[PDB]
Amino acid sequence: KRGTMEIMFDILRNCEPKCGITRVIYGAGINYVVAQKYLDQLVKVGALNIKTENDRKIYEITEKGKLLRTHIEEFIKIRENLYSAKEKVSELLRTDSE
Amino acid sequence: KRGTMEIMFDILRNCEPKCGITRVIYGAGINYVVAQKYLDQLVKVGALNIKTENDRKIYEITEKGKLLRTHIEEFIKIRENLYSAKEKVSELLRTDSE
């Protein structure tokens, strides 16, 4: 179960330099309805530019989009480290005396 | 607003080598009712030993307790890094075009 940040990451990392909807749906593992919503959001915040070529929508990652991809990646990796650190605390919160 | 892990950290870092209730209440910034609950938990999971000396309860951090303190500290620090990383993503999710 992915949140918004992570879906965006999964889109963006499949849109370098360009992506159509096939690449987005299959690369990010999201359906057409979800893809449409997020793509539109990413165009709005300037992470992707949109073109039509051969009657197909083509998205291109922007410099700002590359930075967004990098920052989400960094968030995800730290979040993983946080889960591990929490598990290490939890291991110490057991007892067999009681 | 602190969760359980963090309160425990705030107790433990004030119980080296020993702490009475004054040191726990004032050092961890928690009331007597909260302190009683957490102290009891920390004794149960083997992070503190409890003695009575001069009719006062004295708690001593154990080797396991020192490790618990260290691991919570590490959790807290990573959690802070996660907040910052999230803020950096958020900064990129704005637009003034719409």
Author numbering:
A (entry chain A), B (entry chain A): 7 to 104
The article reads:
Three Sso10a homologues are encoded on the S. solfataricus genome: Sso10a1, Sso10a2 and Sso10a3 (29–39% sequence identity and 55–62% sequence similarity). The structure of Sso10a1 reveals that it dimerises in solution via the formation of an anti-parallel coiled-coil structure. The domain at the end of the coiled-coil is believed to be involved in DNA-binding as it adopts a winged helix-turn-helix (wHTH) motif. Based on our findings we conclude that the Sso10a proteins function as chromatin proteins; they bind DNA with high affinity, and display different architectural properties (DNA bending, bridging and stiffening).
Dimerization occurs through an anti-parallel coiled-coil interaction of the α4-helix. A notable difference in the amino acid sequence of the three Sso10a proteins is that Sso10a2 contains four extra residues within the winged loop domain, not present in Sso10a1 and Sso10a3. The four extra amino acids at position 56–59 in Sso10a2 lead to an extended loop within the wing domain. Sso10a1 and Sso10a2 structures also differ in the orientation angle between the α3-helices. As the relative position and orientation of the two α3-helices is predicted to have an important influence on the DNA-binding mode, this could result in distinctly different DNA-binding properties for Sso10a1 and Sso10a2. Note that the Sso10a2 crystal structure suggests possible electrostatic interactions (K57-E59 and E59-K57) between the wings of adjacent dimers. Such interactions could underlie the observed DNA stiffening and the salt sensitivity of this process (see Discussion & Conclusions). The increase of RMS at high concentrations of Sso10a2 suggests that, besides bending and/or bridging, Sso10a2 has a second binding mode which leads to the formation of stiff protein-DNA filaments. The effect of NaCl concentration on the stiffening mode suggests that this binding mode is determined by electrostatic interactions between neighboring proteins.
